[PDB]
């Protein structure tokens, strides 16, 4: 039998990790145990950049990574993680399957020995606030907590809010005291930190859509039998369907939980947001040398 090593920053009990175990179960079934999967969670081998280098060298067999995260090595890939470029996951999936996506996935393989087998939906960031946000006009003046990360800052800046960097442990009390007016995160994070206790409103801003690519080392892929390749390919697709459905289900359950706890959930029109991000798309189109963003948005 063969044992493949899979590493990830997520921890036990997470959806990424539960889907890795379902992949391990599925590989045991479809191979009669000829394939077994050993899981290294909690960034015990390093962060995604480190485990991606381990895939390049063949020291790690499989790992997760976002499509946009390739922008550190393949700069045009950052386009898909610019705010509001991806309208929903099926749009981000159509970008993954597009000529643009195939070209990135070709460059991943030929340069870095990363074979991307599939992409999975991993949730969407939404915005909570102490006052209702029914349109982009309400964002003016909003003290909005973002991580110190380029695109989350740009989302706050260009919607008209006042981006407020702050360490994650300090935010609950800052929302409680209204020192900060709101924050933006995935819905499971909002329940996890119990931000809903100190936030009366939740806007479905859908400003950032997240994916996980499932990447296997080409050095491992070349050593595998073509039967095993087919088993792995089919197992990843089967588990990705379930992973995407699990995330979509938990978001719907969390919105229903927030509505049951008295939270006002707003659904603003997002085309004003898309038009408000155009200065950031222009900065990207010009630095990348090709008008790419208008191209992904129209898919």
């Amino acid at each position, epitope marked *: 039998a063969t*044992t493949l090593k899979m590493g990830m920053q997520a921890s036990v009990g997470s959806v990424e990790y539960n889907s890795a*175990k379902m992949l391990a179960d599925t590989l045991e079934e479809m191979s009669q145990g000829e394939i077994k999967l050993a*899981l290294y*969670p909690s960034a015990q081998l390093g962060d995604d950049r480190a485990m991606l280098q381990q895939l390049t060298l063949g020291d790690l067999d499989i790992t997760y990574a976002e499509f946009g995260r390739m922008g550190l090595w393949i700069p045009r890939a950052e386009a898909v993680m610019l705010p509001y470029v991806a309208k929903d996951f099926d749009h981000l999936r159509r970008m993954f399957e597009s000529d643009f996506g195939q070209g990135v996935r070709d460059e991943m393989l030929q340069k870095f020995n990363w074979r991307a087998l599939d992409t999975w939906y991993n949730g969407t960031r939404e915005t909570t606030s102490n006052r209702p946000l029914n349109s982009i006009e309400d964002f003016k003046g909003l003290k909005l907590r973002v991580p110190n990360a380029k695109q989350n800052l740009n989302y706050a800046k260009l919607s008209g809010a006042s981006p407020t960097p702050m360490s994650f442990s300090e935010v609950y009390l800052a929302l409680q005291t209204n020192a900060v007016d709101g924050q933006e995160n995935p819905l499971p994070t909002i329940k996890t930190m119990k931000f809903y206790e100190v936030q009366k409103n939740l806007a479905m801003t859908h400003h950032i859509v997240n994916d996980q690519m499932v990447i296997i080392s080409e050095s491992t892929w070349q050593k595998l039998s073509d039967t095993d390749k087919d088993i792995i390919q089919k197992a990843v697709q089967k588990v990705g369907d379930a992973h995407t459905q699990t995330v979509k289900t938990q978001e719907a359950e969390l919105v229903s939980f927030f509505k049951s706890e008295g939270i006002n959930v707003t659904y603003p029109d997002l085309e004003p947001f898309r038009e408000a991000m155009q200065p950031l798309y222009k900065e990207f189109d010009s630095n990348i040398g090709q008008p790419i963003v208008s191209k992904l948005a129209a898919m």
Partner: nanobody, 127 residues
Framework: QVQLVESGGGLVQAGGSLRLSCAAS????????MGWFRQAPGKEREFVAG????????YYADSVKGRFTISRDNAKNTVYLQMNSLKPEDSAVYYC?????????????????????WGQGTQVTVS
């Protein structure tokens, strides 16, 4: 599901030795990382030791390293926590835990309530 059952426990003297056993019911034990937790009365749960299935790695909490030893017997589908040089600090309910496919044991402690299987613990009283 997986059924885990502990053996061993009871009263022991300070400085004494005790061996805990944990037998697993199915045929997933050879592909499961195994661990030992403990909860002393009134305190939080502490991950004590763990042992891998794939790369043989072990974990110990600093409070027991150098005087607990963990080991595995796949032929009997059993893990052992061998408590040498026991201290009153060690008095607690001890719990056996299993997690399939996980390769690295220290990660069991991060979200213990999500782990695959648990035994209903065994009390160890040190005098």
């Amino acid at each position: 599901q997986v059924q885990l059952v502990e053996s061993g426990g009871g009263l022991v003297q300070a400085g004494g030795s005790l061996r805990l056993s944990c037998a697993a019911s199915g045929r997933t034990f050879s592909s499961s990382t195994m661990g030992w937790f403990r909860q002393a009365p009134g305190k939080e749960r502490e991950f004590v030791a763990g042992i891998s299935w794939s790369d043989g790695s072990t974990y110990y909490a600093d409070s027991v390293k150098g005087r607990f030893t963990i080991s595995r017997d796949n032929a009997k589908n059993t893990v052992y926590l061998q408590m040498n040089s026991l201290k009153p600090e060690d008095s607690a309910v001890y719990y056996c835990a299993a997690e399939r496919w996980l390769a690295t044991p220290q990660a069991m402690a991060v979200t213990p309530n999500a782990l695959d299987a648990w035994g209903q613990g065994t009390q160890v009283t040190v005098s």
